[PDB]
Every structure is written in C-alpha cells, then in structure tokens.
Amino acid sequence: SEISRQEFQRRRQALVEQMQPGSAALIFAAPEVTRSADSEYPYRQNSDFWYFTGFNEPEAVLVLIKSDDTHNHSVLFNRVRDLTAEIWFGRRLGQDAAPEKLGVDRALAFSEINQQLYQLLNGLDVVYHAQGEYAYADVIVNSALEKLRKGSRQNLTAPATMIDWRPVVHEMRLFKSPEEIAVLRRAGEITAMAHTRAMEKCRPGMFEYHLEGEIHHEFNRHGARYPSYNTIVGSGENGCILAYTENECEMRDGDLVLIDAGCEYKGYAGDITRTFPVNGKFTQAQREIYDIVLESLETSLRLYRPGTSILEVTGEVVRIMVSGLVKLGILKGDVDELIAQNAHRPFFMHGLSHWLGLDVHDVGVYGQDRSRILEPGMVLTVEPGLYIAPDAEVPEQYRGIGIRIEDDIVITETGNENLTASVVKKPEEIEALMVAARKQ
Amino acid sequence: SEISRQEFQRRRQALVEQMQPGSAALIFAAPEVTRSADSEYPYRQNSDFWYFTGFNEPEAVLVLIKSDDTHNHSVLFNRVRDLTAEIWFGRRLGQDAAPEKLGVDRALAFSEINQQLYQLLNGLDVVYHAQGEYAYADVIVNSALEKLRKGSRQNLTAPATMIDWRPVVHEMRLFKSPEEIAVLRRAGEITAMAHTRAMEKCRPGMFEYHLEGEIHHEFNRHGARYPSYNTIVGSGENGCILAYTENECEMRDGDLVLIDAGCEYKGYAGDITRTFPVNGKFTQAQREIYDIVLESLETSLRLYRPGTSILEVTGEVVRIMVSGLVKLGILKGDVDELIAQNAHRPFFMHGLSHWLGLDVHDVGVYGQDRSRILEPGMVLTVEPGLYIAPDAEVPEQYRGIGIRIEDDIVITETGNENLTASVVKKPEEIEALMVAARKQ
Amino acid sequence: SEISRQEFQRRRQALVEQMQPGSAALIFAAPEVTRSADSEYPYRQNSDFWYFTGFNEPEAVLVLIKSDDTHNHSVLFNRVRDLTAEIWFGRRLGQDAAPEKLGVDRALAFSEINQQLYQLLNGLDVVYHAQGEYAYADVIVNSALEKLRKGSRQNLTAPATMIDWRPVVHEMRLFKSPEEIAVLRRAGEITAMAHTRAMEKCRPGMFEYHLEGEIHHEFNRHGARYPSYNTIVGSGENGCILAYTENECEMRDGDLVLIDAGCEYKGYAGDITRTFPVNGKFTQAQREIYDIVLESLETSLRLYRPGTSILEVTGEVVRIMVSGLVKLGILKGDVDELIAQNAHRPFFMHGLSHWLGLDVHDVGVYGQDRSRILEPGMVLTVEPGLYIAPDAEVPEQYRGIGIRIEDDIVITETGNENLTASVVKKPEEIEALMVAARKQ
Amino acid sequence: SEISRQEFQRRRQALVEQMQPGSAALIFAAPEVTRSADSEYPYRQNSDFWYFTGFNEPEAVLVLIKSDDTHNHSVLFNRVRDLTAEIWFGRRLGQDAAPEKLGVDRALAFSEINQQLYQLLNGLDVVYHAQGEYAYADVIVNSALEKLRKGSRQNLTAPATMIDWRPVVHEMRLFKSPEEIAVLRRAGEITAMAHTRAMEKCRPGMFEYHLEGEIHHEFNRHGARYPSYNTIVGSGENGCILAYTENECEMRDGDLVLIDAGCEYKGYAGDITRTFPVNGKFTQAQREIYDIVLESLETSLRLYRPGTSILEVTGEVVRIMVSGLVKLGILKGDVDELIAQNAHRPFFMHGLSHWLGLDVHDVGVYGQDRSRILEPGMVLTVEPGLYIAPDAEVPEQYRGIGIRIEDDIVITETGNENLTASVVKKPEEIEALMVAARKQ
Ligand SMILES: [Cl-]
Ligand SMILES: [Cl-]
Ligand SMILES: [Cl-]
Ligand SMILES: [Cl-]
Ligand SMILES: [Mn+2]
Ligand SMILES: [Mn+2]
Ligand SMILES: [Mn+2]
Ligand SMILES: [Mn+2]
Ligand SMILES: [Mn+2]
Ligand SMILES: [Mn+2]
Ligand SMILES: [Mn+2]
Ligand SMILES: [Mn+2]
DSSP states (O other), X not given: OOOOHHHHHXXXXXXXXXXXXXXXXXXXXXXXXXXXXXXXXXXXXXXXXXXXXXXXXXXXXXXXXXXXXXXXEEEEEEOOOOHHHHHHHOOOOHHHHHHHHHOOSEEEEGGGHHHHHHHHHTTOSEEEEOTTSOHHHHHHHHHHHXXXXXXXXXXXXXXXXXXXXXXXXXXXXXXXXXXXXXXXXHHHHHHHHHXXXXXXXXXXXXXXXXXXXXXXXXXXXXXXXXXXXXXXXXXXXXXXXXXXXXXXXXXXXXXXXXXXXXXXXXXXXXXXXXXXXXXXXXXXXXHHHHHHHHHHHHHXXXXXXXXXXXXXXXXXXXXXXXXXXXXXXXXXXXHHHHHHTTTTTTTOOSOSOOBOSSSSSOOSOOOGGGOOOOOTTOEEEEOOEEEEOXXXXXXXXXXXXXXXXBEEEEEETTEEEESSTTSOOSHHHXXXXXXHHXXX | XXXXXXXXHHHHHHHHHHSOSSEEEEEEOOOOOEEEXXXXXXXXXXXXXXXXXXXXXXXXXXXXXXXXXXXXXXXXEEOOOOHHHHHHHOOOOHHHHHHHHHOOSEEEEXXXXXXXXXXXXXXXXXXXXOTTSOHHHHHHHHHHHHHHHTOGGGTOOOOSEEEOOHHHHHHHXXXXXXXXXXXXXXXHHHHHHHHHHHHHHOOTTOBHHHHHHHHHHHHHHTTOOEEXXXXXXXXXXGGGSTTOOOOOSBOOTTOEEEEEEOEEEXXXXXXXXXXXXXXSOOOHHHHHHHHHHHHHHXXXXXXXXXXOOHHHXXXXXXXXXXXXXXXXXXXXXXXXXXXHTTTTTTTOOSOSOOBOSSSSSOOSOOOGGGOOOOOTTOEEEEOOEEEEOTTOSSOGGGTTEEEEOBEEEEEETTEEEESSTTSOOSHHHHHHHHHHHHTO | OOXXXXXXXXXXXXXXXXXXXXXXXXXXXXXXXXXXXXXXXXXXXXXXXXXXXXXXXXXXXXXXXXXSSSOEEEEEEEOOOOHHHHHHHOOOOHHHHHHHHHOOSEEEEGGGHHHHHHHHHTTOSEEEEOXXXXXXXXXXXXXXXHHHHTOGGGTOOOOSEEEOOHXXXXXXXXXXXXXXXXXXXXXXXXXXXXHHHHHHHOOTTOBHHHHHHHHHHHHHHTTOOEESSOOEEEEGGGGGSTTOOOOOSBOXXXXXXXXXXXXXXXXXXXXXXXXXXXXXXXXXXXXXXXXXXXXXXXXXXXXXXXXXXXXXXXXXXHHHHHHHHHHHTSSOSOHHHHHHTTTTTTTOOSOSOOBOSSSSSOOSOOOGGGOOOOOTTOEEEEOOEEEEOTTOSSOGGGTTEEEEOBEEEEEXXXXXXXXXXXXXXXXXXXXXXXHHHHTO | OOOOHHHHHHHHHHHHHHSOSSEEEEEEOOOOOEEETTEEOOOOOOHHHHHTTOOOOSSOEEXXXXXXXXXXXXXXXXXXXXXXXXXXXXXXXXXXXXXXXXXOSEEEEGGGHHHHHHHHHXXXXXXXXXXXXXXXXXXXXXXXXXXXXXXXXXXXXXXXXXXXXXXXXXXXXXXXXXXXXXXXXXXXXXXXXXXHHHHHHOOTTOBHXXXXXXXXXHHHHTTOOEESSOOEEEEGGGGGSTTOOOOOSBOOTTOEEEEEEOEEEXXXXXXXXXXXXXXXXXXXXXXXXXXXXXXXXXXXXXXXOTTOOHHHHHHHHHHHHHHHHHHHTSSOSOHHHHHHTTTTTTTOOSOSOOBOSSSSSOOSOOOGGGOOOOOTTOEEEEOOEEEEOTTOSSOGGGTTEEEEOBEEEEEETTEEEESSTTSOOSHHHHHHHHHHHHTO
C-alpha cells in the first residue's frame, strides 16, 4: 500500500479549491540537516511538502497558482540534473522528468527561484505561505515580495495578503483517505511484528538497546527503513521516564520493560507501546498496576467512535485509574473527591490520545482540552499509562514501575478499527508468548 | 575499550598548555536537530565538544580558563536538574554531579550563561572560540564580548584577541592515543563483522536496504547503536554512484553490490567498503575490474608507513590502475603518457585516503594534494575504486560496474596496522564465504 | 496650521472602517538612528506612524483592534515614565497621559510588548502588519504569532491572515484633507521665503553651502526646524548632477546655481527648485535653456487639473523641450521623429512630477507610466529641467548648464493651486530681485 | 586648518607598525542611513575610517596588509565610476583616481569585495577587524574567512587570530597631532562665535529653536556644515534636562537658557555650553548658583595639566559645589561628611570631563573612575553644572534652575590651552555683552 501520483494531484486540487482566485500557494521542502561536520542525517522530507508531492529531495518548492476560479496550474522548483553532483551524491529527478513523474505542469531549476518566483507572484492578490516554517523559505519569499513592492516602475505589484496555509492543510491531513488508512494499517502491522519480536527476543542480561536493534531490523525487513520517532526501551526505573531513549542499561531479571516504538512506512507513523516482564512473568505488584492500565485501554477501545471525544473517553480512564489506585492503597480517599482533585496526575501525567499520520504527533486541531467531536477518518493513539516513581510515597512494592500500553486506531462509521491489535497485550497472552519463546 | 574521564582531562590540560596566559577557551555542545515537526533526530554531540568531555547533552558549554602560566581551571555550563523535564525527556547530569562525573572544577546552569560568561571573560587578553561553528554559540559569545566592551563604567574589559581553536584541536585529534586506537580497533572489528554478515546474507531478490538492515543490526548488537555515516548499498549501476544511499532497488542475479558502511563506537568511526557478487560468483568482466582495485589496495597496504604520504601512495595506485585499464582495453595508449594526462580520472575520481576518527572524514591538515608526511598515530582509510558508467565508451562487458574496496589503518612505527582485515576481500575468499553461506 | 488630535483619531477610524471584523492593525514607530558612536541623528518619526498619532517618540506601537463591525478600540505601547532616563535624555509621555493627549483608549509600557501583544492578537482572524518595514517590528510580530501558533494547550490561536496595510494607508495619504493642504500651503510659503532669501544673498565667491545656511536658517525661523531632504546647491557643472549635495564649491561669476530645497513643517514636505545666475544676470545661452524649462513649467501649471495625468502633461512638456532644443541646434531633425525617439532623454532624464506629503517623494500609486487620472486632493510637484553635460556634443555655449524649476501644487475641483508661486521664476523677475538685493 | 593626505598616510603607517607580520587590518566605511522612506540623512563617515582616509563615501573598505616586518601595502575597495549613478546622486572617486588622491597603493571596486577579500587574507596569520561594528562588515569578513577555512582543496588557509583594532586605534586617537589640535582650535573658535551670537540674539519671546537656528547658521558660514551633536537649548525648567533637544518652548523673561552646542569641522567636534539669562540680567538666585558652577570651571582650568587626572580635579569641584550649596542652604550639614556621602549628586549627576575629537564623546581609555594620568596631546571638556529640579526640597528661589558651563581644552607640556575662552562666561561679561546687543 502506498500513496500514488494521482492522490498527490487530488490533494493539490483540493487545496486549490480552497484558495482565493488570484493567488499562489508556496510549499517548501525540508533542508538537509548536519549530523556531524560534513556528514548529514538521512533525509526526511517536510510532511506538508511530502503530502502534496511524494517527492523526497531538498531544494524543492511547489507553487500552486490559482489564476481565477477555473484556471490553475502548478510549478515545481527542484534541483537540476548535474552529472558530477549525481555521480557523487545520488540521482536527481531534474526538470525534464518532473512533470510526468510528479504530475505537475511545469518544472524549473531551484537555482533560478529568485529570478522566477517574483514573476509568478506578480499581480496576485494573495500568497499562501507558512511563515516561520523554514528560515531559507522565508528569505526566498520575503525577497520576492520586496522585489515586487519596490518594482512599480517595472509595473510589478506584490500580493498584499499572506495567509498561513497550515491550518487548511492540517485539517486536510486530519481526515485520512482510504489509501492513507491502508498505509497506516500496514505501518501498524509492521510495528506490531517488531513489538512481538522484541517480546520473543527479550532475556535478562540483554541491554535495552538490543531490543531497539531487533525492532529496527524488523521495520527494515518490511521496507520501513526508518523509525517514526526515537525508540524508547525503558526497563525498571527507566520505564518511569516518558521518552527515555538512552536505552543503555542491562535489563534485570524481575523488572518490566516498556517499549515505545513505531515505524515510518511511506511517510506514515506507526506508534505502539507494550510493557512486559523482562523474565517473562509479571510479579503480583506488576500485574496489579498492569491490569489498571489494560482496563483503561480496553475500555477506551470499546468507547472510541464518532460523536465522542478524547476528553470524554479520558474521563472514563481517569475513573478506572483512581478506582484501581484506591483499591491498591496507592491513593487514599473517596474516588469522586480524588477524581475532582485530579489525584491520578502524579501517576498518569500525559494525554490519552494524539492524532497519528505523517507525523507521530500528527497535525490537526484538538479543541479545548481535546474536546473536539470525533468523526470517521480520524486516526489516533490510545495510550494510558501509570508511572510509580522509585521514591513515591506508596506501598513499597509498586515503586519504580512504569507501564504504558498503546494502540493506534482509526475512527470508522460504526466505532473504530484497531490497527495494532496483532501484538498481544493481555498479561496471560504476553506470558504465554514469552514462555514459548524462552523454551526455544 | 572506551575513553575515560582521566583522558578527557588530559586533553583539556593539553589544550590549556597551548593557550596563552590570561585566556579562556569556549567549547560548545551541538544543538538538538529537528527531524519532523516536534520529533528530533537522535542526538549527536559535536566531535570537538565530545573530545574534551565525553558528555552527551545539548545546552552545554566547556570553559577552560588559563589565568596565568601555572593557574587554570574549568567551568561547565549544562542543563539544570528539573524533575518535570526529566520525567518527560530523560535524566540530566545537572550541576551537583558534574564536577566529579566529568572532572571539571565547577558547573553552572546553562540558563545563567549570559549572566556569567562575561564575568569569566572580563579582563582576559585572549578568547579561543570557533567562530561560525554554531549560530547559538556565536550569539552567546558576541553578547558577552559586547557587554564587556560597553562596560568600562563597570570596570569591565573584553579580550581584544579571538583565536579559532579548531586548528590546534584538530591537530590534536589527528594523532590518536593508544586508548583511541583501541576504540578504533573495536569499531573496525564491529564494522568488519557487519560486512561479513552482509556477504553471508545477500541473495538475488533481496532489496539493497535489506543488507543495510543486517549491517545496522550487527552494529547494534556490539553496542554501536548508530552508523558513523549513512549506509551505501549500491548494486549494479547504483555502485557507480559514490554515496548512493537510496538503497531502494532489488538486487539482481549477475550484478555486483558495493557496500560502504561503518559503525560509530564510543564516538569513533569505522569505515569499510566491500564489493561482491550478489549471486556469490564474480563474472569474468567483474573479476577483471576487481583485481585492479584489489591490487591497488594491497599495494597501498604494503606501502603505508611513516615517512611516505597519501600523495606518494596515490601515485603508485594511479600506475596500477592505468596499467590494468590499458590491458583490458578500457584506456588506450602509452601508460606513462596516460598517467601524465590523468587518464584514470573518469574511472577513479576521488581520493585514495582520508583521516578517520571522531568523524568519518576526520579533521586534520592534509597538506597540498595530501602531501603531508605520515607519522605514527595517524589513522586513515585506503579506498581505491573503479566506476565504469553504463554509457562509458569502453568494451561493453565493463559498463555499469562500480567497485570500491576500503580498509581502515593506523600508521605505526614500523608501517601500518590494518583494523578491518577480518572481513575478506580476496575474490576467491569472498566466493568461498558466499558459497558456504548459500549452502545453508 | 497643524494636524490636531481629532484628525489623527479620524484617520485611525477611517483605517478601522476598512479593516475586517476580528482584526488588529499594528503600526510601529521609527527606530532611533546612530550618527556616530554614541550620538544619534535628530529623531524622525515614521511617516505612517506619525500619520495616525502625531507622536514623536521611538519605542512606540499603535494597535487598532476591530473586535467586530461595531466595537473597536486602540492600544498604544510607549516608553514608561522614568525619572533618570528623562533627566538625561528628555521627557516621555508615559502611560498615564497618553490616552488623553493622543486620544487612544489605553496605553501600556513598551517594555511589556512581548508579554501583551500576543494576548491582543489571540483569537483574531487577521493581522495588518507592514512586514519588512523594520527588523525590530518583524521580530516582535513574529514572536507574538509564534507564541499563539504554539499555544493551543493554553487555548491560544494566531490570526492566519496577515495583510500589508501600506497600500490602504498610502491611498489615504494620497488624498489630503483641507487641514493637510493648509499645512502644505504653509510649508510652501516657508520654503518659498527661503528660496527668495537665497537669491537675495547669493554673490560670486560665496560657497554653495552658504546658500544652504541661509535656507536652513529661514526654515528654522518659521518653525520648520529640519529640511524635508538634503539641500542641493549645484552651481556651474554641479547643476548637471541631479541630487548634488556636497555643496562644497565656490560659486563663480558667470555660472548658474540650481537650488533644490524644502522644509519639513509639521511632518509635511515643501519642495522647491529655482535656478538663477550667481551674478544676477543670465547669459544669452543660459536664458535660452531657461526659457524652455520655464515654458515647460508654465504650460504644466495651466494644464494640471482633475481628469488629466502626469503622463499626459509630460507629453506636452516633451514636445516643448524637443521643439526648443531643435531651435537652438542641440537636437537635430524632425520634431515628431525626435519625440518618437525620446531624443530629449539625454537632457531631461527624470519625471516631471512626484506626489508630495509626509514624504517628499510621497506614497501613493502612480499607475503605469504615471498614467493615473488626477483627482482633487492630490498634491504633486512640477519640476521640468534640462541638463547639458560639460562634454555634450552640442553647441559649446550650452555645455555645463543645469536648470530645474519646480513648484508644488494641489489638484482642486477647478484645476490646481500653486503653493510655491511666491518665489519668482520669470527670468526678468529673478534679475530684478537680484539687482535690487545687489544694490544694498 | 585641515588634515592632509600625508597625515592620513602617517596614521596608516603607525597602525602597520603596531601590527604583527603576516596580517591585514580591515577598516569599513559607515553605511548610509535612512531618514524616511527613500530619503537619507546627510552622510557621516565612520570616525575610525575617516581617521585613516579622509574619504567621505559609503561602500568603502581600507585594507592594510603587513606581509612581513619590512613589506606592507594598502588596498581600498570603493564604489566604481558610473555615469548614471553619478548624474543622479553625485560624483564618485572611483578606482583610477583613488591611489593618488588618498595615497593608497591599489584600489578595487566594492562590487568585487567578496571575490577579492578572501584572496588578500589567504595565508595570513592575523586579521584585525572591529567585530560587531557593522552588520554588513561582519557579513563580508565572515564570508571571506569561511571561504578560506573551507578551501583547503584550493590550498586556501584562514588567519586563525582575529584582533579588535579598536583599542589600538582609539589609543592613537586619544593623542592629537599638532595638526589635529589646530583643527580642534578652529572648531572651538567657530563654536565660540556661534555661542556669542546666540547670547547677542536672545530675547524674551523667541523660541528655544530660534537660538539653534542662529548657532547652526554661524557654524555653516565658517564651513562647519553640520553640528557635532544635536543642539540643546534648555530654557527654564528645560535646563534641568541634560540633553534636552526638543527646543520647542518660548523663552520667558526671567528664565535662564542653557545652550550646549558644537560644530563639526573637518570631522572634529567643538563642544561648548553656556548658560545665561534670557532677559540679559541674572537674578540673585540665578547668580548664586551660577557663581558655584563658574568657580568649579575656573578652578578646573587652573588645575588641568599633565600628571593630574579627571578624578583628582573632580574631587576639587565636588568640594567647591558642596561648600557653595551648604552656604545657600540647599545642602545642610558638615561639608566633609556631605562630600563623603556624595551629597552633591542630586544636583551634579554627570562627569566633569570627557575626551573630545572625531567624536564629541571621544574614544580612549579613561581608567577606573576616570583616574588615568593626563599627558600632553589629550583633548577634553570641562563641564561642571548644577541642576535644581522644579520640585527639589530646597529654598524655593532655586527650583527649576539648570546651569552648565563648558569649555574644551588641550593638555600641554605646561598645563592646558583653553580652545573656547573667546566666548564669555563671567556673569558680568555675559550681562555686558547682552546689554550692548539689547541696545541695538
Ligand atoms: Cl538547481
Ligand atoms: Cl539550565
Ligand atoms: Cl518602557
Ligand atoms: Cl562598486
Ligand atoms: Mn503515542
Ligand atoms: Mn508511543
Ligand atoms: Mn572512507
Ligand atoms: Mn567508506
Ligand atoms: Mn521634487
Ligand atoms: Mn525638488
Ligand atoms: Mn561635553
Ligand atoms: Mn556639551
């Protein structure tokens, strides 16, 4: 499953439909990024630029011109063919092949952008530009507008109105096409296979980073070369650090390990968390905390549907958590009073759900306190957790336990589809999986 | 093998020894780097900052103060302990633990750098600063100097002399300690194991990125979490692109595959290239080109020693290459005349050797045309190659062949030590290795 | 004559009337400007900021908030009262007095602008900002918008639409109120008195800068402390340099002197040019060129009216010039063919007319080739000239003659009013004036 | 009196003498400065650039190259000859004429500075640059150094050492040549004539700005076109504001007026303050305060000599002031105790003396608390004052009196020479001068 040229074209047209007549939208590629000295990190295209192109080169700009209500066209600026640059650093699409390959009307050399961009903006009423997204982009746009403003003797005029297209584009990205959902489904499957593998490989004495290695290898074998975010492998007390990425410790017999990892497949993020015993068997204390987090997730998965909200479902989770923590003596008092005091917050301090897509923390308006009403096509995570610090004033057997369990779902007409349920999460199923692996 | 606190301290002292009395050296950490939106790439410390600290956090500055010829001390600015920031994003060293952990005299919060740095520079004659290394660093230094310049009514004075410490520090980095050589030896071993694995795993129909996956997994299992540069897996015509990193193609029965990959182990780079038949058997044409590249490497390995130079050894390689290409009918004419015309350059267009260390293309002065006389402690690669383009005007059977073979060496009193000879390169040994793997 | 608080308020309201509901307009003061080291040039307020405030301090920002179609209000950010700063550098209006003094609703300290501006923009749809006008202003606005964009967890939202208010404001400035015309009339009178004085004071052997001194003293005595642009006193060959401001030469018996000077009175520019003989008597050659320039001006003054254009009147001037130059043998050929070839351009190389107001080259759209149809309330200059270079291929007696004659006019319902006719320009009147002065 | 080409050359050579062998010094011209929209303030050259060139154009850079201890040469970058630019905006020196005119070895177009500067710095050990002086200059220098740093393959090397030449150059400027003293003497005379004129012209009912007009006209007639700083005309309570420049009030019968004004003559500043009765007669209260300030000045003029300091002489002034204020009942208590409490500070809140030269507040190190020992060739002001605020808790008759009296002196072998004593300051002489003028 992938996103095709025709879908990128549909997206461009959908943006154009929303634009004022006599306008242009400017969408800039990500800059290359230094890792150390003359070496660069592996290139990651800007998500919005990718969304409209599927084009994985830097020094590229998509220009959508809406001349009036019926006439519109697209111009791509991108790197020229250059034999020497290509022998050294890789092939470039160039100008000749770009119109057919990407489905744009015209392509020009990026080297000519300052000589050409102002000519494309001349006489328009509106420019759509994500001001502040990239310094190099702001420089180019500001220079073009200045040339126009100062060019009345050459009969040039600048568009007086600049509109940030990010809100419009992010609202588009918030609602996935069936093709996007298919890509995210595959990302979920790939990510789930990696998590199953980590559970089957984990043994006391392995380092946290060893499970990262297994996970990243599994991503790669299915064609997801890169993770969508830095892998978290937090064993023991490290599980109480939310985005622990050091992954530097030897995993101890008797500790839990929390793994938060996701692949990036055709630009889209998977995002799964599983927590499990390093030695394949939950202790009683570990199981007691685990059960509360799992009940929170299972209830959320029953509830998520069009017409509810992340806020509403969070309320149900908070009650489950406070109730369970009271039962274990971690919290003390009346459940309703404790809920009113947000007494869960020392142990569950983050959100239940974030949007998921071309970014792991995907774009799109949540509403105040994540109250926005859910509709079909939205994709989100469900990630309750409980984190009991090593020095927490709680019964001693719970100290240093960090548990999160996270699935990715899509809202459907009739509820939700769980994209990541192919990796187990019921404690008896986790134990059975690990027992079977440990016998090999 | 690693670099210890005491060695980082020795390095700091060695720099101080070279500094003028009444001076301070300022060494800044790398900024964190965005991958997409709110997600960051895995952190990579600045090599020079790492060299003097072994400290892997951003928002840190090492200040070495040489008050006079006997008195000197060190101050680290680094991120404060903060419970909330740490629960979310990871532990921080903080100020209390830094002096003992890192072996610095004093530690202050990075948040106080603008309030404190000018006080440390006040009245000094010289400041050592790598101007232009980082924008955020230049801002801090320039602000401090401005406060001093403009502060005569407060009895403040700025050092009038600013010296770039990069030349001094890079000359230090050019000559490895025995401990650094031990780390590089391990990096070589790890990298060699990964390359052997790639050869043993490679089959027709696998994707180029599959070998990347095997390699990166092997790095990880030995505790080298990250590669030192983006892995190159160039099969068939892709092998003729020097830093081909797309690694997106299905590897064909009958093609060669060129793999250039290296681990980063305790900050240090391995860097190996091996080229081999995807199907385990060189064709005659492939073997003919391979033999020339291998003879070039083997001769270079015999020759490299104190008192010669990369330029001198390159001359020997150029003769081997021109001679071999003439014999195959790829070049035509008198060998000496062809050498004088640099007739090899269409097929061997890069340098034979680069320095190796905390960066894969390591720091240090090469001399004009890489003529600097070699001395013990220098570490460098040896990477001859021949690249015959698909459209080259040569006998047809050689078109589309890209071959490079690369080892990492250290110059010793008596010649050189090859750090990467534990992965095979003789064609009969490559074939035997692959035959044995293909039978499993 | 001046502009009052109530008029500044009317202007603010007129802008608000043009703004979208749910918007704010941001108008920034000019920065102070270094002359040398710690000394500054005399402060000149930004013309647009002045237009809406009559407030002559730096570090001030006018914010007009249009909450909806009936509700709007104004906030001024300006420097706080500060005893010490004021003892040293002068009084400040401060926050307490500003609402009554300026007629704004609220005033806040400029020091609080970053803490307050984002709160004023929060939830609005549109921000009107002159992007690129001042770096310090862009920094403030961009920072506020960034806080809002990144503040969804604090329920903050940024206006997505940014509109340059310069086109709207400059169209306002293009049409003068009766009060503005009264101020410009006084500027014209003051400027004319200064030019009359220069003619009456000029003698051979005086330096060009001496006439500048007389002019600037005359401006000052009528309460126009500063010129509206750098005074030009170009005698002899210097008159052929359009904006010659060196004014460093001894004025020679037998040369003409061209004086282009104007006062700045209550923010508004006068702009007069007169050219006259240094010794009080035009030579025949000088008179021959002068007559052509004067006929050009006199004809233009008869013609300028609503319904014509600067382009149309320029056409008449070009014919007068080509005809006269042909008669003197400076141009050769058929007048109509010469006009078609723009053969006047070596001798008359600038525009006939520019808008006049708070800037000498005032704001406002001219139309292609200054073709915009004139309407009552527009104020413009009329400044034909002929400049015959020292090395021009023309009859020798004309070489080194530079003549311009310039008046300021306002377009009225019935034609135009000349604001600067109280300084003579007929050659016999110039001679009579100078003869009378030279007898004293 | 002026500074000649040969003196500018001597200065360049004196700097070169102080430079390390294998170095270059870069001295940049001031940028042009916007007044409003497309109009600029009258150009003021950077004082340090002027000091080494006497060249009054922007877009110019002086490069002094010290190849070794015997060989050195100079290169000027400056604007090219351009017929069109010159017809419009004025003549340019250009490259052909610059070597002879300025006495530099070579001249190149400013447009070529980025193509040429790095070539001049290549292989040098040291660059002298005033970092942070001008943004445009920093950009040029940083770009050149970057080209060199990154150009090892082209055999380029950057100087590692950057030295701020400002301390060396400012120490040069601190000690005036006899020719500089002659120029400053003329500036003093011109400034004194202007102050005498202001006293002779002043009448009740004139505006403060009228005296500014008289002063500026007097500067101009002697060939000092511009003031060295913004003229202060502070009548009545305005005299209690130190740098009151509004000069907007009608001068009242019975008030004092304080005038602080100085010309700029050949780059050098005059700086005189005189305070006098608007109506020509000091009141008793006014005279009582005046006498203390005058005694302070007269004593300082007797004392200033080589071997004392501004700090030492200030001590004498403070005693005079405290003693006088006690006698009038403005201060109460023991004089020595009051001195120890710095009880004068509410009434005399600024320094007695600043250096004077190419800047009114001239460059040069003062020492802690202006304790530097004075030597021949130093030029400084002497400017005691007393400022009794309108609301001061003092006998009512002294409220609202602001008095300063300021002369410019040069330290000589035998004491000092007063450059500004040709304008009167004894109260009886001021009265006599004004009485005589008021009778005309
Ligand atoms: Cl390009
Ligand atoms: Cl901090
Ligand atoms: Cl303020
Ligand atoms: Cl130029
Ligand atoms: Mn998540
Ligand atoms: Mn997650
Ligand atoms: Mn290499
Ligand atoms: Mn390599
Ligand atoms: Mn004009
Ligand atoms: Mn004019
Ligand atoms: Mn002074
Ligand atoms: Mn003064």
